[PDB]
Design a protein around this nucleic acid. Sequence first.
DNA 1: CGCGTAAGCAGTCCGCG
DNA 2: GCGGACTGCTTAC
Length: 901
Amino acid sequence: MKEFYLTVEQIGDSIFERYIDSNGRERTREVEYKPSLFAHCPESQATKYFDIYGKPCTRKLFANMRDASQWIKRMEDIGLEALGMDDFKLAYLSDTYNYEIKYDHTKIRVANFDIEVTSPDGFPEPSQAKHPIDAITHYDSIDDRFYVFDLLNSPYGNVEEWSIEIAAKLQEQGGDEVPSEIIDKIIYMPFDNEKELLMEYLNFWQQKTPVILTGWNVESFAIPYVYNRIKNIFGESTAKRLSPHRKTRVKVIENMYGSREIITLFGISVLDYIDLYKKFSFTNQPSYSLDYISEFELNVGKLKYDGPISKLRESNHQRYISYNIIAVYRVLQIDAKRQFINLSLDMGYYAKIQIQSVFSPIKTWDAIIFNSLKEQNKVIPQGRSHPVQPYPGAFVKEPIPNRYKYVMSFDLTSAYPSIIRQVNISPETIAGTFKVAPLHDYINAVAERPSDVYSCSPNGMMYYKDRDGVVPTEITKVFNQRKEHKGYMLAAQRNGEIIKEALHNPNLSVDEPLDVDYRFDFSDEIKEKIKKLSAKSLNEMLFRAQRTEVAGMTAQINRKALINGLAGALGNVWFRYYDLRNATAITTFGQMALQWIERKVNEYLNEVCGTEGEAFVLYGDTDSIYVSADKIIDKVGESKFRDTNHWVDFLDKFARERMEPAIDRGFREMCEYMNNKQHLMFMDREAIAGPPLGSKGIGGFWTGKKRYALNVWDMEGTRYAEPKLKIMGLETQKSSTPKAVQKALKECIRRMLQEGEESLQEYFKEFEKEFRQLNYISIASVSSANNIAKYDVGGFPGPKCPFHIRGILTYNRAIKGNIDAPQVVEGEKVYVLPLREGNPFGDKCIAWPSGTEITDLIKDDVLHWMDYTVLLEKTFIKPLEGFTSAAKLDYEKKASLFDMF
DNA sequence: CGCGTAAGCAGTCCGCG
DNA sequence: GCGGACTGCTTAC
Ligand SMILES: Nc1ncnc2c1ncn2[C@H]1C[C@H](O)[C@@H](COP(=O)(O)OP(=O)(O)OP(=O)(O)O)O1
Ligand SMILES: [Ca+2]
Ligand SMILES: [Ca+2]
Ligand SMILES: [Ca+2]
Ligand SMILES: [Ca+2]
Ligand SMILES: [Ca+2]
């Protein structure tokens, strides 16, 4: 097999590399790598090295890496560009792995761990590490084993050994219900003292050194806690044994308000799963506790116990340990679903970077672009300093707030990356400028043609047409991977709908789910067998189909995120190829494209309908259009349709056969107007929306920009067994809206769009009457809490104090003088409830850490003083009033002359 | 900590005769 | 009350 790196580090004048050798064995080496950098040279000087603009360069080979770094600094002192990859480990990987890397994940040691620390005096600060580590569970991917290190004797209690037999029993047998599928994979190690536990942990760590190190909050808590605890007990050199090169660094993580400390372990790639989830899941969660995220992702019940965690070990060590093991398994379960580890390895090896660098789109693109250019003996420019400057982005159309009955939507495939490829936007393809006319003049095709030579953007930029730039070339490669995975995702989604259909008529039989590849549309034979299956088998297939779809979604959406990130990187001052001319070339072309195609679709439909000046495009945002299809439907007349699916086919057919060719012609003209290199504006049909045939449903509504709802029957070729709501921006979609309020508002919208005004009025009356019985957590608002200190004036609200911050200060006063009972963490999320006039808390709201029950000290007082009236007006009635006025409906029945009999 | 901009709504402070 | 100036937060793309 071809070799591949696991980790790489620069330590002084040495490169330290852990790798898999040609025999699939893990090895480590230290290599005194001599880097090269570059300077411009005269043309009379013969070379094979050229900068990206075609100017000749001489290669400078250094005795060592520090020499190279010193040269860079001197070049700055002289005032001359020092060209080349200045991140030497990236150059080392490029020289050592000069081919497309094939990696074998089964050879990569992936460690998932969690620690427990009993603390009576509040949260155990990792930088202090003053309390004993009393449990460690460490899963090894190569062994497939959970290693449990259990402290029996502590200053906070001496306990009995954990029992695997009790751990396996049902909660209803007094057990811990540790999943039977991991019972035989647990390797249990009790210890009489903490010193021997840690000493044994480090020895195990040497034998089985993690390559990829993950778990939940391991980077901010577990890793620094273990390092600092070992440091405090044994000294620094022993703590540095967590790094296979015995090198570590305290890294200061700064943000807008304050900073925090992490421990960089050289030769380890830390991928904290919380950070993988936030980056790759495309959710925004009210809480990031592992129990909350596990509930969300896996529908597993919260890990339940009596008393605080600080008393759990001494009161129920059996459960304490089982829940530590379960915590580790839960992260593994989430990853089997979301596959964020697999994703990170794919992208990291593709770019030829340190795996943990997948967190940085700038670092990822820098390496992809460097490896690409290096292949043609081209030489990358020096990174430079730039002041942060604002620049313009997308166009969004102001919609007329209304109901809209029948709607069809269209948007560009991979908009910004497609703009890059079409126009040929790249640092090295800039050809010059042309004199710009107002954007309006290009939209309406009255402005002079920009160039008869070069490919243009309405921002004034011109680009070469003889050859692809490196940005277009490389963005195309990831785009293509993206397309493949999106293909698998959509097929699994369509397959899911077939299974849902079949479930209306399940057979009374005993059988198995079919062995199938859900990434590919079901053949007729499979469809035939499916209609003969039991409910049990069908459901399992549905679960498997939806897992495949999730796998497809992870692979495609994060590849889209990377290529969209290159467009954004052009407007980030730290990017090597930062250029506001290119960043604005993309966004400004996007503005034209949308408004151009809006004009064209309007013109085409006015012609089709024999009218003039009517707006068929009601809305659009960035790269998308929403077309009113009332007139298309009315031209055949609703009476002609058999059922809803009939008009859906008709609109589907109209979009494919009439709209899209019209749209394509409009864009091909635009491409020639701009003299672009290649036509790549592909605006495919997204949604087909309307009320159920025969109903009083309103179909859809818009309240303003980025705020709308549609009753969708077909989405990108997926025909749903049941209509699905596409809701954007409205309160049902915000993590700040109470859980139960999101649900009630969604149902109000369902009824508006599918059933009509009277159905909505019936539901509202019921919700208003019953909502006071909702559990307080379900009706609490949610907000991030930044700058709690800035607004704290002797424990009271200072000027301009945010409402959610006021709640926190109220909480702080009410718990003051409690070393136990949870503190609100700066920068994390809180639940917020209003309080009625004249409460014991002395203020109008209270906030507490999100994902948690409010501490029992004040819970009963909070519940008694919760302002249900304010809560209902603010989170439910006010948004609903917004929805219904836009849609020209009333959520309460008005008086009529019929009320007279 | 980690690519970009546009733009919505909650809330505070305060004007508005 | 409601809106504009402003801060804070969150979402659409
Ligand atoms: N998260 C983001 N980061 C940066 N730019 C974005 C992001 N989301 C959207 N954009 C910009 C770039 C996109 O190409 C453009 C259109 O957005 P959108 O339609 O959501 O994605 P897309 O057109 O790239 O892919 P798709 O083919 O799935 O429509 O808006
Ligand atoms: Ca724990
Ligand atoms: Ca798009
Ligand atoms: Ca059947
Ligand atoms: Ca879009
Ligand atoms: Ca599409």
